[PDB]
Amino acid sequence: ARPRVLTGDRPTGALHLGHLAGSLQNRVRLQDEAELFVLLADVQALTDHFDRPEQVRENVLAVALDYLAAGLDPQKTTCVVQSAVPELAELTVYFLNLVTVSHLRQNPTVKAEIAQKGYGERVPAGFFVYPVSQAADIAAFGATLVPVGDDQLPMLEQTREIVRRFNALYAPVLAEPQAQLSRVPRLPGLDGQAKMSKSLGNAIALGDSADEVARKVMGMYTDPGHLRASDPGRVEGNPVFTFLDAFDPDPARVQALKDQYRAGGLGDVKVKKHLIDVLNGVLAPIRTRRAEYERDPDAVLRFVTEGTARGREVAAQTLGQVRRAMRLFGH
Amino acid sequence: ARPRVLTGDRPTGALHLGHLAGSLQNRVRLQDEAELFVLLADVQALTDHFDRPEQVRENVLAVALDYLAAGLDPQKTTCVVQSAVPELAELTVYFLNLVTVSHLRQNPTVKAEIAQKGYGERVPAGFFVYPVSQAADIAAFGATLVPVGDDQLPMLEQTREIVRRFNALYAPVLAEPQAQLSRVPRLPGLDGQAKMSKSLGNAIALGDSADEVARKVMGMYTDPGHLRASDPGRVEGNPVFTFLDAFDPDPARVQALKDQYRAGGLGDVKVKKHLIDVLNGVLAPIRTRRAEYERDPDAVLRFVTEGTARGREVAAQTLGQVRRAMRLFGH
Numbered sequence: 190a191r192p193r194v195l196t197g198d199r200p201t202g203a204l205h206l207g208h209l210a211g212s213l214q215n216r217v218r219l220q221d222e223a224e225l226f227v228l229l230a231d232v233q234a235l236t237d238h239f240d241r242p243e244q245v246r247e248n249v250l251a252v253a254l255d256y257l258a259a260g261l262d263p264q265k266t267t268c269v270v271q272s273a274v275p276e277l278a279e280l281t282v283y284f285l286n287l288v289t290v291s292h293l294r295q296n297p298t299v300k301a302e303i304a305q306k307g308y309g310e311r312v313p314a315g316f317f318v319y320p321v322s323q324a325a326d327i328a329a330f331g332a333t334l335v336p337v338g339d340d341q342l343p344m345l346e347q348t349r350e351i352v353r354r355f356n357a358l359y360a361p362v363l364a365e366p367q368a369q370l371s372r373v374p375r376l377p378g379l380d381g382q383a384k385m386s387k388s389l390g391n392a393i394a395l396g397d398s399a400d401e402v403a404r405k406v407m408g409m410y411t412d413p414g415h416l417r418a419s420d421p422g423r424v425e426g427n428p429v430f431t432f433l434d435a436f437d438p439d440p441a442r443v444q445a446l447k448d449q450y451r452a453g454g455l456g457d458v459k460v461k462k463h464l465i466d467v468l469n470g471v472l473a474p475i476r477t478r479r480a481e482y483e484r485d486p487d488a489v490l491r492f493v494t495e496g497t498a499r500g501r502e503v504a505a506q507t508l509g510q511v512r513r514a515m516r517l518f519g520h
Numbered sequence: 521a522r523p524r525v526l527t528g529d530r531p532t533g534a535l536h537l538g539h540l541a542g543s544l545q546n547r548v549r550l551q552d553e554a555e556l557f558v559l560l561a562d563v564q565a566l567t568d569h570f571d572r573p574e575q576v577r578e579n580v581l582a583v584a585l586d587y588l589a590a591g592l593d594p595q596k597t598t599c600v601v602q603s604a605v606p607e608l609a610e611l612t613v614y615f616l617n618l619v620t621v622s623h624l625r626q627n628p629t630v631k632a633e634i635a636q637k638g639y640g641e642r643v644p645a646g647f648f649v650y651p652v653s654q655a656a657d658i659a660a661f662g663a664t665l666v667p668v669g670d671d672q673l674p675m676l677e678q679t680r681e682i683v684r685r686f687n688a689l690y691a692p693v694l695a696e697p698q699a700q701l702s703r704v705p706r707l708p709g710l711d712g713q714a715k716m717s718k719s720l721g722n723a724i725a726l727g728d729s730a731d732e733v734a735r736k737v738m739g740m741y742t743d744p745g746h747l748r749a750s751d752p753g754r755v756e757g758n759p760v761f762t763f764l765d766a767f768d769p770d771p772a773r774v775q776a777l778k779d780q781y782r783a784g785g786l787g788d789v790k791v792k793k794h795l796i797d798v799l800n801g802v803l804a805p806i807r808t809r810r811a812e813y814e815r816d817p818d819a820v821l822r823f824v825t826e827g828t829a830r831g832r833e834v835a836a837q838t839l840g841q842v843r844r845a846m847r848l849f850g851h
């Protein structure tokens with residue numbers, strides 16, 4: 190290890206492929222290259238599912254299972270349930286004083302999410318405010334490295350800003366996190382959309398059976414205009430190729446089909462058939478690992494409970510420093 | 521001691537005659553017919569004093585001394601420091617999901633403070649959502665009665681909507697608070713301005729010496745058109761008479777003074793000299809206890825560290841039922 194790295198997910202359901210290439214395999218490797226913390230954004234998940242609390246509770250354990258099956262080792266990663274670290278809420282309140290409503294209003298990502306949900310001015314306060322809640326997550330765990338989708342840059346930058354303003358006003362005891370850009374941009378949905386999500390129903394979950402994964406690939410959007418094999422096709426906008434580009438290890442092999450497909454002797458079926466196995470291959474182990482844990486549920490609970498303790502420990506240490514730096518009565 | 525009453529002050533400076541008339545007298549009455557809780561809201565004080573943490577820190581004990589000087593009984597009233605009870609922060613973040621930015625922006629009292637503050641759009645997030653942290657305060661301490669001036673009713677009503685929203689969404693575990701309406705008009709400042717404030721420089725601190733109180737009353741605004749004693753003068757708008765209606769034990773003298781003043785020949789001197797006698801009678805006992813408690817710093821500290829202990833446990837319980845009600849992982 191070396192730097193402290195904070196990553197996480199909003200527990201709203203099983204993890205899928207987009208996550209995988211999105212980060213899961215990234216943290217799998219940074220798992221021994223540093224101190225990795227994985228936050229099950231229990232609380233942030235409510236700024237959206239405040240009306241479906243049952244849903245969240247159920248998915249904390251489910252995502253943790255996903256995490257383990259994906260290759261994360263209990264011995265090298267601290268899994269933390271946000272709600273069980275009240276210290277984060279404390280720090281969020283303090284942070285709220287360091288940013289203006291107008292600045293929160295110009296966050297491009299939150300503005301897009303807001304328009305998509307049709308909230309309008311009727312945006313729940315908790316949601317409108319989740320970016321600073323995230324900054325608190327980062328700062329409380331002392332994270333210096335935060336993998337970030339292109340999409341989550343505004344938030345990351347807001348965190349540095351707030352940390353910076355906090356150190357100047359009070360005392361310099363918080364670290365400015367630095368970003369870890371990724372290569373594969375947000376993996377698209379089977380739909381052909383930009384985002385894969387259980388909500389959009391265009392996802393291949395990490396728990397899906399060989400049968401399903403194959404069925405999901407076969408219904409995958411490809412290329413209209415390309416009606417029959419013979420015909421020439423084009424890779425731009427074709428999810429299968431941007432799937433191979435993120436799950437297929439032999440690029441020479443990839444750029445291969447990319448030739449033939451532009452030509453006309455590579456039927457979308459053959460492209461699919463291939464890719465379906467490139468996925469079964471990347472998934473095969475994950476499936477077996479899941480069964481093991483599924484049979485040792487006690488161990489998943491362990492992973493969550495032990496890590497949450499460890500992490501609260503860390504949050505508690507930072508808050509002590511934050512409370513004294515702020516000159517709060519008593520310390 | 522039947523219904524739990526919650527009240528408070530954001531610790532920003534010393535208390536003055538305005539708070540005495542506006543809330544303290546009533547609070548000294550409440551400690552005998554209810555269970556009184558007073559919140560030294562240093563967290564809330566930070567929503568706009570985030571740039572002056574020293575000022576806030578220092579005023580927690582100073583206002584505490586003022587509560588005591590005023591007559592609040594350490595054996596009757598629970599005095600708690602908001603900072604020292606993180607459960608409130610934890611509760612406010614959950615409450616943020618039960619309210620819309622839209623509805624928060626509509627709060628008439630906060631809209632007016634922002635107006636007077638001249639923030640513009642540059643409103644600090646924390647300050648914009650402070651009515652919810654107050655809602656969190658009420659619900660956590662499980663207060664069923666909250667003393668309120670019509671200026672704080674929208675804060676109170678929102679608390680009501682929130683609790684109502686929380687019980688219907690999770691489980692009916694929070695008590696709905698009820699208002700204890702008004703304290704009759706707010707005490708105007710020495711130069712007659714609508715508001716009495718240290719900031720405005722037109723106040724009489726509870727801690728002001730009997731001499732100072734005399735001086736301050738002498739230089740009080742009266743009636744622009746009243747130029748000499750012989751002249752007739754107006755009562756309305758004349759704070760010397762507004763102060764008399766709020767503190768003069770016998771309205772017979774008051775009404776008599778009013779008569780002879782509109783008549784003519786009754787100068788500001790004879791009236792003011794009589795205000796001085798009525799204020800010194802209301803203030804003298806407050807000055808003695810204040811000085812007394814100054815000799816006993818430990819007794820003031822005991823007042824707050826114990827109310828806080830009590831408060832912390834009460835909030836702790838409520839969060840217990842809140843967490844379970846919310847179906848939070850592990851509850």
Ligand SMILES: Nc1ncnc2c1ncn2[C@@H]1O[C@H](COP(=O)(O)OP(=O)(O)OP(=O)(O)O)[C@@H](O)[C@H]1O
Pocket residue numbers: 197198199201207208210211212338374375376377383384385386387388389
């Ligand atoms: N298409 C994707 N590409 C890369 N990462 C993704 C993708 N979808 C989700 N993630 C990641 O998974 C985590 C969860 O975030 P989030 O809950 O917003 O996903 P979502 O797809 O928008 O789900 P939903 O619409 O069900 O709430 C984050 O780490 C996020 O970056």
Ligand SMILES: [Mg+2]
Pocket residue numbers: none
């Ligand atoms: Mg989402």
